[PDB]
Amino acid sequence: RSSIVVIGLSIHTAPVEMREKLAIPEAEWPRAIAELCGLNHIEEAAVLSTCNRMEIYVLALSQHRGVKEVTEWMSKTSGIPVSEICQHRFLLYNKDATQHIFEVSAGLDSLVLGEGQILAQVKQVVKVGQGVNGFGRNISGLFKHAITVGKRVRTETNIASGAVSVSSAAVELALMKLPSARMCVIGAGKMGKLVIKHLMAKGCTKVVVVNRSEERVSAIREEMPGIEIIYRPLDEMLACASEADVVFTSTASETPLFLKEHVENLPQASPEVGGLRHFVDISVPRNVGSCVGEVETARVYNVDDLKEVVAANKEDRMRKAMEAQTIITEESTQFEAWRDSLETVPTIKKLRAYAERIRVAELEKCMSKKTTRAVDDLSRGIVNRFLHGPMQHLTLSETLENMHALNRMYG
Amino acid sequence: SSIVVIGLSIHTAPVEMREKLAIPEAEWPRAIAELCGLNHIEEAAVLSTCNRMEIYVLALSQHRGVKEVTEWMSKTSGIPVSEICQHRFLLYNKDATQHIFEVSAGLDSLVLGEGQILAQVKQVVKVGQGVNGFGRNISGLFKHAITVGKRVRTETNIASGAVSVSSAAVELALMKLPARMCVIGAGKMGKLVIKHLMAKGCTKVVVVNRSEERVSAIREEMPGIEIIYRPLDEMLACASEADVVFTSTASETPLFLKEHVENLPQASPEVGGLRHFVDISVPRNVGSCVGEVETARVYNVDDLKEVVAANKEDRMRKAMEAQTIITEESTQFEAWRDSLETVPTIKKLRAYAERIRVAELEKCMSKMKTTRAVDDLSRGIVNRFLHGPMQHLRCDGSRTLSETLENMHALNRMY
């Protein structure tokens, strides 16, 4: 009866300036989930917060009321009015929802038509969620089965991770906008490391890397001997951007690192590269204020702006994204069977108790007329000899029909 | 297992051939047991009338049961298997039930000239009672036919085969004249022929019967007509004094052959010196050779078929509603018949439970006045645990069919 619902904003609809207001740091996922499960028609929840999407997966008692509650909650936490959110809201139920989260995890819904993508993020959601009570059987199962799908599709389609494609796209765009340009990367985590790899493969031999800690950059430097990596601590940020022509920002900061004030005071980029400083900001929330675009000699790009790249062997238009959909169609119906095989739990318990109410009444009825252990045992023996059979019968399609039968034949 | 109808009917076979297949009511039990004695025939019924001969069976295998029944038909009629094959009418399952519902209603598309066989269906069920082979599927089929026939009668008022045959007999006889009436046989059909003679204005009839009791009874119940009894041995003389002779005895051999009637003096010149034999008996009471006599005309139930059909259509009312009744009950029957596949699991379940119960009861009774209580506990627990699965295996027809049957397979798996 109860529905699994997906309720989201994605890059397919909402802009990054809208989407980043529903962004939920990993450290606040357990809090978010608890809040959602506090709503009257929501029993389980999970948040999938990535750069292309903010998606809330719930197990709702009522579809309509679940959607009203989660949407009102989105409005409260983000600051965004319900009316705006509804205009960009994405909504699917049950089979469509599991279908969706399978395509997302496989890389068949985001932005390039041949991508990872969210397999790493679906694993992170399962990790973080293990302690979280609200992350119950249904939604955890969905996500776990999404991990399975992600991996299968990955080996068939061989489609690179979403992290690989966004970083790849950042380098292509920078090289697109440029007519030796000085490269600078702020945030040496997974993504900035990827940006650096893509710059190397493009032939870049020197990059200045600004990071919170030096240790990460030390690792990367040790790991990539071929290129000259120059570490700079975060408080030297503004010096770096001024000695750079393009600035990649890839940090988990929840507030912009650059406002209009910071960049207008920066010396102009070299005329050799057109006199413009290209801020390529692949962070969500963004590390660059959109006001920076008011600065004449500056250019700002965010994840949404990687859409005018999307060019990398388009022949996977079918192959990858075709070989994968068959996987998705078989795993879905497999998962639905699995979901249906969960109501088998309330049945095993109940049926036992159903026979236990008959056993007790008849026992009691008899005892009003250690022979007492004899008849107690007789009453247990008859019942166990009737439960024992149905105990294992609760293939999976025959186990399912067994369950439905007991329910019809009893309660 | 399928329900099969295997028939010859006036749609294709003349009476000279049909009558060889005719099976008297006293021999239904023998025939059904002969039939059920075949390797693939679990149940059987014989529907013998003047327009048709139909065997209804429950067969293990469609082609094998049919070949076996066909052989039995040939073996009991004298008719070679290849002639029978030529005329053989065949329908399976839902088509067969639809068919028997129509025949019972007097709505057989292929035999338009017959009238309701409801009386004859009721008789088959009545005689079937004591007949081993007349099983639950076929008796059920026939009983449902009975219900359909009655409903359809109440809605359309299609006459019986009996009424419509005797009525056609008199009508035809009157069409062939521009008359001294004789009727041979005073049972159901002959009484009806007399009634239709009165209905038409006849005030005198010579009635030849084997026993007088029947004719005395008729004589008394119909005081307005002069009824002249005459023993069977005199029937030839009666013929020589009649201008039309109705024959309607259950004799399985002919009463008049050509030698008998070429002998007789010519019928009155006032009816055109032709003596009309209207023979409504199957098997025929009048030899066909009688038609070779120049001053004579013979007719049999085959010749009535058009005049029966015309009258049935003339008096036709509420055809659609009738066909609705048939379509719906057909599916209601299939529903009831699907329901029956639940009986074996019910018994197996009940044997299973009883074996557990006594086993556990004897355990307790080897460890111990109060023996009926401890007994009661055991049956009480079983019956109460079983009652749900026992009311969810019995249904009528609606939905719950698929569920009921899925409980069956589940109960099969879990035990």
Ligand SMILES: NC(=O)c1ccc[n+]([C@@H]2O[C@H](COP(=O)([O-])OP(=O)(O)OC[C@H]3O[C@@H](n4cnc5c(N)ncnc54)[C@H](OP(=O)(O)O)[C@@H]3O)[C@@H](O)[C@H]2O)c1
């Ligand atoms: N990962 C993806 O699949 C994906 C794809 C595209 C874009 N993005 C976006 O890109 C950004 C980075 O993601 P990531 O996966 O690279 O993260 P990550 O591996 O966890 O590292 C984030 C980096 O940002 C730094 N950082 C964290 N908080 C900061 C703060 N408050 N101020 C300044 N620096 C801070 C960290 O420095 P330390 O090493 O010293 O801790 C680290 O180098 C995020 O906004 C993310 O949403 C993610």
Ligand SMILES: NC(=O)c1ccc[n+]([C@@H]2O[C@H](COP(=O)([O-])OP(=O)(O)OC[C@H]3O[C@@H](n4cnc5c(N)ncnc54)[C@H](OP(=O)(O)O)[C@@H]3O)[C@@H](O)[C@H]2O)c1
């Ligand atoms: N009933 C129908 O719906 C139907 C329709 C059309 C035609 N028919 C045919 O018409 C014939 C009569 O049927 P029914 O239902 O009217 O019969 P019925 O009520 O059972 O009576 C049959 C009559 O035939 C006589 N009879 C029986 N055996 C005889 C024999 N060996 N020799 C001379 N007479 C004999 C009987 O004499 P007793 O009185 O002395 O016993 C009785 O008068 C049958 O051949 C039948 O197939 C039947």
